[PDB]
Design a protein around this ligand. Sequence first.
Ligand SMILES: *SCCNC(=O)C(C)(C)Oc1cc(F)cc(F)c1
Ligand SMILES: *SCCNC(=O)C(C)(C)Oc1cc(F)cc(F)c1
Ligand SMILES: [Mg+2]
Ligand SMILES: [Mg+2]
Ligand SMILES: [Mg+2]
Ligand SMILES: [Mg+2]
Lengths: 6, 6, 236, 236
Amino acid sequence: GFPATV
Amino acid sequence: GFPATV
Amino acid sequence: GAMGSMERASLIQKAKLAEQAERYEDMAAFMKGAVEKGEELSNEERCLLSVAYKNVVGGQRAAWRVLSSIEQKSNEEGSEEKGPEVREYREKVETELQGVCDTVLGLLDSHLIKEAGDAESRVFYLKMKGDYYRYLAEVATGDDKKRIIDSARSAYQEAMDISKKEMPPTNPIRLGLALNFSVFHYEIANSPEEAISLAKTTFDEAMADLHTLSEDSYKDSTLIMQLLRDNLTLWT
Amino acid sequence: GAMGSMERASLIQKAKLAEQAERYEDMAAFMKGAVEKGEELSNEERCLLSVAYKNVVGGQRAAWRVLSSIEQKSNEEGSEEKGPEVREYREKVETELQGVCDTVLGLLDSHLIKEAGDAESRVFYLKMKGDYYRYLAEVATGDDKKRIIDSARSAYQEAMDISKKEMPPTNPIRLGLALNFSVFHYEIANSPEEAISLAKTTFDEAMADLHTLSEDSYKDSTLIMQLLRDNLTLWT
Ligand SMILES: *SCCNC(=O)C(C)(C)Oc1cc(F)cc(F)c1
Ligand SMILES: *SCCNC(=O)C(C)(C)Oc1cc(F)cc(F)c1
Ligand SMILES: [Mg+2]
Ligand SMILES: [Mg+2]
Ligand SMILES: [Mg+2]
Ligand SMILES: [Mg+2]
C-alpha cells in the first residue's frame, strides 16, 4: 500500500 | 498474435 | 560521455524511441547525453528526462524493497542464518540506486537549476531534486541521513515557495510537487499530519480554480487531484 | 569473469534473490558465473539459467520488434525521412540481443552440452541451443542467415531424437522442446504445415500418456499441452 507520486 | 514458447 | 558524439536532436529522437520500446535505461542515457550538451531543456524534454529516470529508479526501488524485506526476515529470531548473500545483494542494488540518484542530482546541479529562470522549469527541477534526495533518504542509514532528508525538504520547500507565487493552484507541476512533498512528509519525515494537511489544502485550492481551465487542462489537473485524494484515502 | 571470486553456492542463492526481485539481468550474470565454475548443473540450476536468459532476451526481442516496426513504417512511401536514428537504435538493440545469444551459446558449447550425458540435461541444453539460434535467426539478414536457421534446426532435431528415445511423451522438457521447434517451423522456416503437424502429434501422444502420471506431473504436462493447443488455435 505505497502512495502515489509523479 | 505471437505464439507461445517456453 | 559516451553520448558526446551524438547530435542533441538525435539523442532526443532516440529517447522517444526508447520510451516506445520500454527501454528506460537507454532512454535515461540518451537524455543525460542531451542535458550534457549544455543547452536548456524544453517542457517536453524535461518530461522525457523525468520519465526516463523515474522508471529506472522506480525499478531499483522496487527491487530494493523486495531484498530489504527478505533481509529483515532473515534477521528475525528463529530464522536460519543464510550468510552474507542477502545483505551483499541488497547492498549491490542499493549502490546502483544511489549512483543513479547521484547522476540525476549531478545533472540538476551542473547546470540545469542555475540556468532555469522561468517558474515551470525551476519548479520542475527543484521537485526532481527533492525526489532524488527522497530516494536517497529511503535507503540512508549513516551519519548523513538527516542531511539527506533535509536536502530533500529544502529543495521541495524552494519549489513550493516559487510555485505558490508564480503558478496557478491547478498547474500540474505545482500539483505533482505537492503530491510528492506530501509523500515526503508521510514516508520520510515521520510527519503524517503535515502530509495530510498539504494534500488536503492542495486539493481544495485546485478544486476552486478548475473553473478557469479548458477541457484539456482540466484533464491534466484532475488526474493529479485524484492521486492526492487516493493518498488521503490511504492515510485517513 | 566478474563473478570469478564468488562462491558457486552464493551465485545460485543470489540468482534466486534476483528472480524474486525481477532483476533478470543480474540473475543471468549470476547464473553465467555459476556455469563458469565448471561443474555440471542440477535440474533446478538449469531452470534458473534458462529463466534468467529467457527473460533478458525476451525483453530485447520485444524492444527490437517495436523498433523494427517503426523502421518499416519510416521506410514506406509518403513517409517523411527521419534520418538514420531509427535504424541506428534498432541496430544497437539488435547487437545487444546478438551478444546475449552468443553468450548463452558460448556457455552451451563451453562446456555444458559435451558434459551432459543424461537425457534430461542434454535435451534441455540442445533445446536452449535451438532457442538462441532461433532468436539470432529472427534478426538475421546476411550471408549467414541460412546457416543460422540450420543451426537452430540441427540442435532442435538432435534434442527431438534423444527425447523420443529416452523420455516419455508427457515429459515437460520433451513437450517444451516440441512446442518451441513447432514455433521454429512456423515463424522461422516458413513451414506452417510442419509446425501444425508437430504440435498436433505432440499433443495427442502426451494425452494418451497422462494416465500414467501423478497429480503433480499431470499439472506440469497439461500446462504445456495447453500452450500447444493455443498455438494450434492461432494457426488453424
Ligand atoms: S512531464 C510528464 C507529463 N505530465 C504528466 O504526466 C502529469 C500530468 C502527471 O504531470 C506531471 C508529470 C511529472 F512527471 C511531474 C509533474 F510535476 C507533473
Ligand atoms: S525449467 C522451469 C520449470 N518448468 C516449467 O516452468 C515448465 C513446466 C514450463 O517446463 C519447462 C520450462 C522450461 F523453461 C523449458 C522446458 F522445456 C520446460
Ligand atoms: Mg550539434
Ligand atoms: Mg502550509
Ligand atoms: Mg568454491
Ligand atoms: Mg514427424
